[PDB]
Design an enzyme around this catalytic site. Structure first.
Site, PDB file in Angstrom:
ATOM      1  N   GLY A 177       0.764  -1.236   0.000  1.00 28.22           N
ATOM      2  CA  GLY A 177       0.000   0.000   0.000  1.00 28.22           C
ATOM      3  C   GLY A 177       0.795   1.287   0.000  1.00 28.22           C
ATOM      4  CG  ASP A 226      -5.733  -8.480  -6.343  1.00 26.82           C
ATOM      5  OD1 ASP A 226      -5.081  -9.076  -7.225  1.00 26.82           O
ATOM      6  OD2 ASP A 226      -5.228  -8.092  -5.273  1.00 26.82           O
ATOM      7  CG  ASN A 258       0.044   1.237  -3.799  1.00 22.16           C
ATOM      8  OD1 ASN A 258      -0.825   0.378  -4.020  1.00 22.16           O
ATOM      9  ND2 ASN A 258       1.170   0.967  -3.145  1.00 22.16           N
TER      10      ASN A 258
HETATM   11  C1  LIG Z   1      -1.255  -2.438 -11.686  1.00 25.29           C
HETATM   12  C2  LIG Z   1      -0.194  -1.525 -11.047  1.00 25.29           C
HETATM   13  C3  LIG Z   1       0.713  -2.123  -9.985  1.00 25.29           C
HETATM   14  C4  LIG Z   1       0.497  -1.471  -8.624  1.00 25.29           C
HETATM   15  C5  LIG Z   1       0.392  -2.427  -7.458  1.00 25.29           C
HETATM   16  C6  LIG Z   1       0.522  -1.700  -6.138  1.00 25.29           C
HETATM   17  C7  LIG Z   1       1.032  -2.698  -5.099  1.00 25.29           C
HETATM   18  C8  LIG Z   1       0.547  -2.570  -3.664  1.00 25.29           C
HETATM   19  O1  LIG Z   1      -0.596  -3.148  -3.457  1.00 25.29           O
HETATM   20  O2  LIG Z   1       1.283  -1.960  -2.795  1.00 25.29           O
END
Ligand SMILES: CCCCCCCC(=O)O
Length: 178
Positions: free
Chosen positions: A44, A154, A73
């Site tokens: 996150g 997800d 994010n």
């Molecule tokens: C599809 C774009 C990749 C971003 C994932 C972010 C990871 C997280 O959950 O910290």
């Protein structure tokens, strides 16, 4: 014993799994008695939260290289790419000043985020990489997407089964750079 510090988010910390199961831990295993991999990633974490932690990590770990894997994010939450770009720039500066070598990983958003936004987000990476003349590693998730069996529900996070493969690919990409 040189140190590779990984400044990233869930993609590097692991999502819904322990840190020991995430690829950085597996990479540290195969780079045993070679190079130390310090996984300083948190699920996150936006690019700012990452930058906020960087100073203390550089100071404590005195890393030769820092793999930066942040921004996902921000884009995912619709932040201003102009802002994200600014944060990532400070991160790179911090790394350089720490006399360390920054390694930037390219990040890409889901197609369902609009063409306009995705192009602006994505362009940040090549731009900063040119700006600081640093390696721009490709986005490892691109290979993972091609294997539904390596993705969590997800459609965003790689699963446990995918970790060893990501570790191998990462070892290959990082080799010439270490
Ligand atoms: C599809 C774009 C990749 C971003 C994932 C972010 C990871 C997280 O959950 O910290």
């Amino acid at each position: 014993a040189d140190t590779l510090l990984i400044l990233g988010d869930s993609l590097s910390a692991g999502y819904r799994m322990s840190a020991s199961a995430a690829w950085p831990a597996l990479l540290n295993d195969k780079w045993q008695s070679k190079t130390s991999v310090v996984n300083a990633s948190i699920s996150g974490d936006t690019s700012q939260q990452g930058l906020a932690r960087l100073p203390a990590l550089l100071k404590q770990h005195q890393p030769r290289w820092v793999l930066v894997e942040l921004g996902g994010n921000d884009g995912l939450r619709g932040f201003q790419p102009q802002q994200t770009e600014q944060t990532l720039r400070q991160i790179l500066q911090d790394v350089k000043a720490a006399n360390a070598e920054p390694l930037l990983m390219q990040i890409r958003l889901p197609a369902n985020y609009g063409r306009r936004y995705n192009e602006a987000f994505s362009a940040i990476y090549p731009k900063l990489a040119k700006e600081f003349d640093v390696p721009l590693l490709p986005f490892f998730m691109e290979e993972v997407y091609l294997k539904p069996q390596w993705m969590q529900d997800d459609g965003i996070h790689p699963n446990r089964d995918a970790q060893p493969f990501i570790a191998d690919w990462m070892a290959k990409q990082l080799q010439p750079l270490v």
